[PDB]
């Protein structure tokens, strides 16, 4: 037995966070293919979201690996379908993505608070090394996108949406 | 004599499909030079269509080569002049091109149905290997273009048409 | 609109098959991490299943891409949790995996039958090019593994399980 | 003692000009980070100003080095906070920057006049070699920017501001 | 004097932890040479433990270096002889090693708790950067070994012990 200073509460919260990252991965998968539709056709937006799907899956896998390293047991639940089947405009999609990220970030913060209360400094190191800063960086990038998309909706919404995709998402 | 399991009905349909691909080649030739007119001057659009002319000719030549491999006899008809002398806007031209492609695709599907009824699995392999998927891919790309062109016609049609050509057709 | 010769029945079946491949991906994800447990610790088995997770996800993504190419609409459902939380011996796990693969293969065959009834030769080409042969190859490899694992269970089950992992899964 | 033909009046004016260049450096530092705000998010503008911060600091350091070479004594004052905490639009910011540059340029000209009255040809060579032409070049570039930004404010101010940043500040 | 926010309690605990790492280094030194005995002769096991001796010494040296950086004073005690002169089977030895590691890990956790109570964030950063994760990784690897060794003791203990050494410790 390797397990040491690893609470059942942390263990459960880690499994839940795995589920959240995989669901976020699935949502980005859905976002990406929506933007590849022939009637939506924003290549840059598709690529931005499909790269996010991959990053979220890798996040989940790092959690799992850590679960195993600590002597916890991975438990998998259903992955709930994404919150929408169609994602509207690039603006709507980027808003949906930032809401999703802030929810992941809150989960990460709830898990740090749990780790601190349980006195689990390995867990806190883990999250600091691989999660907190990356999530902050992503959220800042999404905020930057949203600001640029918004400046580009004048009365020429189609034009702005094309330009953003061609000149930022490049 | 090499001919084996190659019906006179398939043979005729192959010659007809050759004629269709060559006519499509000629239409793209006309589309390309229209966009090179000094009073139209959309370089990217010219290059997109001239590359299509070449792909359609190569399609025809692969058919012919297969006709000969099976022991059929190539028979050539008049190539009808393209359906228009002037092709309007990039939008009009891309619509005309997608109609043309869907007609080629339907011909390809009619020839697969004929091959299946004649029990000609070489023919069906041929079309699968070199035609069905390529036609599907092209049609999807044209749908994507049309969607982007359409989003770019606000009330600034000239501006949109320039940007599409500069930033997509690149 | 690009959609041509693409039935609503094929479209639904493609979405279902996407769901099956993603669920199979999730099952392999669970299989892989079970074998990375400190109390199971079969590195080779973990790597075999984690590579399968990735192949199944890529399968799903190729389906989705094809869905979009044909003018279908991707629709995502819940991904059901894997059928087990713990997977027993390497033998048990490989049996579970071959059952899973035969179920995917049957789904692939049901979709070819549907494509043939709908007269959809693009769909049939798609499955032939990327799915049928790969699934057959994998199933044969799993059969080969199962045979070797089984020959290795004498009365020295632990020894056999170690050797298989060290000398085959390498 | 090395000091030769170096008036106390030149010496003081050099220290003042150091202070001006460092303050200009600090203003550009503030301009740069304002444009990196998530609610402003104009990467190109941030980079243009942060490069200016660095050039102004280097200007100051060349002055200081010359002060020491001539046997003067560097004296440092407070660096006053920048004139604004928020800098408005890219247009507003570029106007603020050109005003700042013209004030530095005037200081440079006042110091050449002082050097000529004191008969200090080393000082005049120094300013000619490293300051006068560089300041003129920068001011011309800022004038060019301002002209392009202004042409880009139609009634689509957001669009113009995005394009300038993407296609000029690149 | 450099010392700042560095308690006498942390300082003592750091010296104690140095002693623990050096003793662990000495124990691995003894484990390694036991496995090089002509009547034990398990090369792979010798190399695994001698590499551990080195890692534990380096751990000690990083502590010492940090002690000096913070203005603490290194104080050395006797290094107690290892707990055994002969270490039994590879299984016995790996069990002894995991007990040793869990004791080091507990010491590391006691020192983080002490650092948190003393409000010493440099100390906590230090341990996170170089100790907590490495200790967790090692313990997981030892758990994995133990599991494989245990599966290999059937009634053919000699055979299992040879195979583990040849095919894992490689
Ligand atoms: Au995508
Ligand atoms: Au994409
Ligand atoms: Au994708
Ligand atoms: Au924490
Ligand atoms: Au913490
Ligand atoms: Au903590
Ligand atoms: Au974003
Ligand atoms: Au975005
Ligand atoms: Au971006
Ligand atoms: Au052309
Ligand atoms: Au051309
Ligand atoms: Au041409
Ligand atoms: Au066919
Ligand atoms: Au066929
Ligand atoms: Au056929
Ligand atoms: Au097109
Ligand atoms: Au087009
Ligand atoms: Au294109
Ligand atoms: Au794995
Ligand atoms: Au693995
Ligand atoms: Au994995
Ligand atoms: Au089929
Ligand atoms: Au078929
Ligand atoms: Au078919
Ligand atoms: Au297998
Ligand atoms: Au297997
Ligand atoms: Au294998
Ligand atoms: Au900046
Ligand atoms: Au910047
Ligand atoms: Au900067
Ligand atoms: Au002068
Ligand atoms: Au002068
Ligand atoms: Au002068
Ligand atoms: Au400028
Ligand atoms: Au500027
Ligand atoms: Au510029
Ligand atoms: Au050794
Ligand atoms: Au050794
Ligand atoms: Au040694
Ligand atoms: Au701590
Ligand atoms: Au701490
Ligand atoms: Au601390
Ligand atoms: Au070990
Ligand atoms: Au070991
Ligand atoms: Au090992």
UniProtKB/Swiss-Prot annotation, chains A, B, C, D, E:
PROSITE patterns: FERRITIN_1 (PS00540), FERRITIN_2 (PS00204), FERRITIN_LIKE (PS50905)
Subcellular location: Cytoplasmic vesicle, Autophagosome; Cytoplasm; Autolysosome
Keywords attached to this entry: Acetylation, Cytoplasm, Cytoplasmic vesicle, Iron, Iron storage, Lysosome, Metal-binding
Region of interest (Catalytic site for iron oxidation), residue spans: 51-58
Entry binding sites for Fe cation: 51, 54-55, 58, 61
An example Gene Ontology molecular-function term: iron ion binding
Domain Ferritin-like diiron span(s) in chain numbering: 4-153
GO BP term, example: iron ion transport
InterPro entries: Ferritin, Ferritin-like, Ferritin-like_diiron, Ferritin-like_SF, Ferritin_CS, Ferritin_DPS_dom
Domain of life: Eukaryota
Residues of the signal peptide: none
GO cellular component terms listed in the entry, alphabetical order: autolysosome; autophagosome; cytoplasm; cytoplasmic vesicle; ferritin complex
SUPFAM superfamilies: Ferritin-like
UniProt record similarity statement: Belongs to the ferritin family.
Known role: Stores iron in a soluble, non-toxic, readily available form. Important for iron homeostasis. Iron is taken up in the ferrous form and deposited as ferric hydroxides after oxidation. Also plays a role in delivery of iron to cells. Mediates iron uptake in capsule cells of the developing kidney. Delivery to lysosomes by the cargo receptor NCOA4 for autophagic degradation and release or iron.
Oligomer status and interactors: Oligomer of 24 subunits. There are two types of subunits: L (light) chain and H (heavy) chain. The major chain can be light or heavy, depending on the species and tissue type. The functional molecule forms a roughly spherical shell with a diameter of 12 nm and contains a central cavity into which the insoluble mineral iron core is deposited. Interacts with NCOA4.
More info: In horse spleen the light chain is the major chain.
PANTHER family: FERRITIN (PTHR11431), FERRITIN LIGHT CHAIN (PTHR11431:SF47)
Name listed for the protein in its UniProt record: Ferritin light chain
Gene that encodes the chain: FTL
């Amino acid at each position: 037995q390797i397990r040491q200073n690893y609470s059942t509460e942390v263990e459960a919260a880690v499994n839940r966070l795995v589920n959240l990252y995989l669901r976020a991965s699935y949502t980005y998968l859905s976002l990406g293919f929506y933007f590849d539709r022939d009637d939506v056709a924003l290549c840059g937006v598709c690529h931005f979201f499909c790269e996010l799907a991959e990053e979220k899956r890798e996040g989940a896998e790092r959690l799992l690996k850590m679960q195993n390293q600590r002597g916890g047991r991975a438990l998998f639940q259903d992955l709930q379908k994404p919150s929408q089947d169609e994602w509207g405009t690039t603006l709507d999609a980027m808003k949906a993505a930032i809401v999703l990220e802030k929810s992941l970030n809150q989960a990460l913060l709830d898990l740090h608070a749990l780790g601190s209360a349980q006195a689990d400094p390995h867990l806190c190191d883990f999250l600091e090394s691989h999660f907190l800063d990356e999530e902050v960086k992503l959220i800042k990038k999404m905020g930057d996108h949203l600001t640029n998309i918004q400046r580009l909706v004048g009365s020429q919404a189609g034009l702005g949406e094309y330009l953003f995709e061609r000149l930022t998402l490049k």
